[PDB]
Amino acid sequence: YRSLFQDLELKKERRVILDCERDKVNDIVDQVITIGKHVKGYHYIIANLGFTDGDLLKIQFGGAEVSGFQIVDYDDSLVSKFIERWSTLEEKEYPGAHTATIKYTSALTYDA
Amino acid sequence: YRSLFQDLELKKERRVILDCERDKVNDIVDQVITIGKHVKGYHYIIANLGFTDGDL
């Protein structure tokens, strides 16, 4: 990645569209924080439905502008009453349930 | 720290001398990485004998 972003800085791209899984999103996000090129001037677009599924806090204050797509609108009460039931589940019996967030893949599984 | 470094960026200090324990060094280092102001132009001086003891 240090080879990769310097090759991006051979042309000095301030406009990056990532398209990865939320693991490989957060891998490359940590690589951006490694090189530190998340200051203002850069722009980042994440191309999955899990915009909320990433590490938003770690580059919330980094400087660059991050815009993405989220299908799981947490503002809806129909979504919220699910989260009122989802977050109160047992985390040991249901792994990944007790968190107030949820993957969109888990949301589409429940919708299926 | 986000309040603190912005107060440093009220005067825009590119020259910072830290003086902390290696825990509190690595705490503030992670705060510099949080605000991202560890790009070229800034300078940092660590004022303990444990230069190698930090997160280099």
Short mmCIF file of C-alpha atoms in Angstrom, two decimals:
data_model
loop_
_atom_site.label_atom_id
_atom_site.label_comp_id
_atom_site.label_asym_id
_atom_site.label_seq_id
_atom_site.Cartn_x
_atom_site.Cartn_y
_atom_site.Cartn_z
CA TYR A 1 0.00 0.00 0.00
CA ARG A 2 2.90 2.36 0.70
CA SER A 3 4.07 1.46 -2.78
CA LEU A 4 0.50 1.87 -4.03
CA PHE A 5 -0.39 5.28 -2.59
CA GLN A 6 2.95 6.73 -3.66
CA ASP A 7 2.08 5.53 -7.16
CA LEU A 8 -1.19 7.39 -6.63
CA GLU A 9 0.91 10.36 -5.52
CA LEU A 10 2.92 10.04 -8.71
CA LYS A 11 -0.25 11.54 -10.19
CA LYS A 12 -1.39 13.01 -6.82
CA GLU A 13 -4.95 11.73 -6.68
CA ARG A 14 -7.08 13.75 -4.27
CA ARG A 15 -10.15 11.77 -5.37
CA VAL A 16 -10.27 8.08 -4.44
CA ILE A 17 -13.18 5.68 -4.88
CA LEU A 18 -12.67 2.54 -2.81
CA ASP A 19 -14.68 -0.61 -3.51
CA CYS A 20 -14.00 -3.35 -0.96
CA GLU A 21 -15.51 -5.42 1.80
CA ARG A 22 -15.69 -3.73 5.21
CA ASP A 23 -12.64 -5.70 6.31
CA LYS A 24 -10.69 -4.67 3.21
CA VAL A 25 -12.22 -1.21 3.52
CA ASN A 26 -10.90 -0.88 7.08
CA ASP A 27 -7.58 -2.38 6.00
CA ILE A 28 -7.02 0.31 3.37
CA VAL A 29 -8.47 2.97 5.70
CA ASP A 30 -5.76 2.05 8.22
CA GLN A 31 -3.27 2.30 5.35
CA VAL A 32 -4.51 5.83 4.62
CA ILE A 33 -4.05 6.61 8.31
CA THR A 34 -0.62 4.96 8.11
CA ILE A 35 0.49 7.28 5.31
CA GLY A 36 -1.56 10.05 6.93
CA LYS A 37 -3.04 11.24 3.61
CA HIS A 38 -6.52 11.68 5.08
CA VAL A 39 -6.07 15.41 5.59
CA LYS A 40 -8.33 18.01 3.98
CA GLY A 41 -8.03 18.08 0.21
CA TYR A 42 -8.41 14.34 -0.27
CA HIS A 43 -11.82 12.86 -0.99
CA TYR A 44 -12.89 9.28 -0.40
CA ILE A 45 -15.93 7.43 -1.72
CA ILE A 46 -16.81 4.01 -0.32
CA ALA A 47 -18.71 1.82 -2.76
CA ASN A 48 -20.60 -0.66 -0.62
CA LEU A 49 -23.87 -0.42 1.28
CA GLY A 50 -22.00 -0.67 4.57
CA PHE A 51 -21.06 2.97 5.00
CA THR A 52 -21.94 2.71 8.69
CA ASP A 53 -20.22 -0.69 8.92
CA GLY A 54 -16.75 0.83 8.61
CA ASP A 55 -14.53 2.61 11.12
CA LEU A 56 -16.10 6.05 10.89
CA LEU A 57 -14.56 7.50 14.05
CA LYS A 58 -10.93 6.98 13.11
CA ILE A 59 -11.18 9.36 10.14
CA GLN A 60 -14.12 11.39 11.41
CA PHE A 61 -11.57 14.04 12.40
CA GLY A 62 -8.77 13.23 9.98
CA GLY A 63 -9.62 16.00 7.52
CA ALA A 64 -10.52 14.33 4.23
CA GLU A 65 -14.10 14.18 3.00
CA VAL A 66 -15.74 10.76 3.11
CA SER A 67 -19.04 10.10 1.35
CA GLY A 68 -20.72 6.76 0.91
CA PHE A 69 -23.88 4.74 0.52
CA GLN A 70 -25.96 3.27 3.33
CA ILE A 71 -29.11 1.23 2.74
CA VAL A 72 -29.83 0.69 6.45
CA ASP A 73 -31.50 3.94 7.45
CA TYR A 74 -31.29 3.95 11.24
CA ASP A 75 -33.63 6.96 11.44
CA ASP A 76 -36.75 4.88 10.72
CA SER A 77 -38.79 3.67 13.68
CA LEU A 78 -39.43 0.39 11.85
CA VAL A 79 -35.65 0.08 11.71
CA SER A 80 -35.33 1.41 15.27
CA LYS A 81 -37.86 -1.01 16.79
CA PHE A 82 -35.82 -3.76 15.17
CA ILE A 83 -32.66 -2.34 16.79
CA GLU A 84 -34.65 -2.05 20.04
CA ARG A 85 -35.07 -5.82 19.66
CA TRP A 86 -31.71 -6.48 17.95
CA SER A 87 -29.42 -4.80 20.49
CA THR A 88 -31.23 -6.45 23.42
CA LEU A 89 -30.39 -9.91 22.09
CA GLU A 90 -27.79 -12.09 23.77
CA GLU A 91 -24.38 -11.54 22.21
CA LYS A 92 -23.21 -15.01 23.27
CA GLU A 93 -26.21 -16.83 21.78
CA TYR A 94 -26.37 -14.50 18.76
CA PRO A 95 -22.86 -13.28 17.88
CA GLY A 96 -22.88 -9.71 16.62
CA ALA A 97 -26.40 -8.97 17.84
CA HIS A 98 -25.98 -6.83 20.97
CA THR A 99 -24.29 -4.02 19.04
CA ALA A 100 -26.56 -1.15 18.06
CA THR A 101 -25.08 -1.23 14.56
CA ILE A 102 -25.75 -4.01 12.07
CA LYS A 103 -24.33 -5.09 8.72
CA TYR A 104 -26.48 -4.54 5.65
CA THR A 105 -25.98 -8.21 4.80
CA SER A 106 -27.59 -9.07 8.13
CA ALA A 107 -30.34 -6.58 7.29
CA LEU A 108 -30.96 -8.18 3.90
CA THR A 109 -30.94 -11.60 5.55
CA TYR A 110 -33.69 -10.52 7.95
CA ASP A 111 -35.58 -8.92 5.05
CA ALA A 112 -35.27 -12.11 2.99
CA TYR B 1 -6.73 16.76 22.69
CA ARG B 2 -8.90 17.75 19.72
CA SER B 3 -9.57 20.92 21.67
CA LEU B 4 -5.86 21.14 22.49
CA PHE B 5 -4.32 20.70 19.04
CA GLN B 6 -6.82 23.12 17.50
CA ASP B 7 -5.66 25.62 20.11
CA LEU B 8 -2.17 24.80 18.88
CA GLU B 9 -3.49 25.39 15.37
CA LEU B 10 -4.84 28.73 16.51
CA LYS B 11 -1.14 29.63 16.36
CA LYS B 12 -0.30 26.75 13.94
CA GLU B 13 2.63 25.17 15.73
CA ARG B 14 4.73 23.05 13.40
CA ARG B 15 7.25 22.49 16.21
CA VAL B 16 6.11 20.42 19.19
CA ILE B 17 8.22 19.18 22.09
CA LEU B 18 6.43 16.44 24.00
CA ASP B 19 7.53 15.45 27.50
CA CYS B 20 5.60 12.45 28.83
CA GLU B 21 5.87 8.85 29.90
CA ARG B 22 5.85 6.30 27.08
CA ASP B 23 2.21 5.54 27.83
CA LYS B 24 1.29 9.23 27.74
CA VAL B 25 3.66 9.64 24.80
CA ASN B 26 1.83 6.94 22.85
CA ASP B 27 -1.50 8.38 23.97
CA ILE B 28 -0.73 11.79 22.47
CA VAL B 29 0.94 10.15 19.45
CA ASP B 30 -2.35 8.37 18.76
CA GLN B 31 -4.05 11.75 19.17
CA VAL B 32 -1.72 13.20 16.53
CA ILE B 33 -2.65 10.28 14.29
CA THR B 34 -6.30 10.92 15.17
CA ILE B 35 -6.11 14.52 13.97
CA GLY B 36 -3.71 13.37 11.25
CA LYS B 37 -1.33 16.32 11.77
CA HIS B 38 1.77 14.13 11.49
CA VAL B 39 2.33 15.03 7.84
CA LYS B 40 5.52 16.67 6.58
CA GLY B 41 6.00 20.17 7.93
CA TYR B 42 5.36 19.27 11.56
CA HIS B 43 8.27 18.43 13.84
CA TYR B 44 8.11 16.42 17.04
CA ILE B 45 10.68 16.11 19.81
CA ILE B 46 10.24 13.48 22.52
CA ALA B 47 11.86 14.40 25.81
CA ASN B 48 12.49 11.11 27.57
CA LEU B 49 15.24 8.53 27.26
CA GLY B 50 12.77 6.03 25.83
CA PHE B 51 12.87 7.11 22.20
CA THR B 52 12.89 3.46 21.16
CA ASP B 53 10.25 2.64 23.79
CA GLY B 54 7.50 4.42 21.86
CA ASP B 55 5.45 3.40 18.85
CA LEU B 56 7.96 4.28 16.15
#
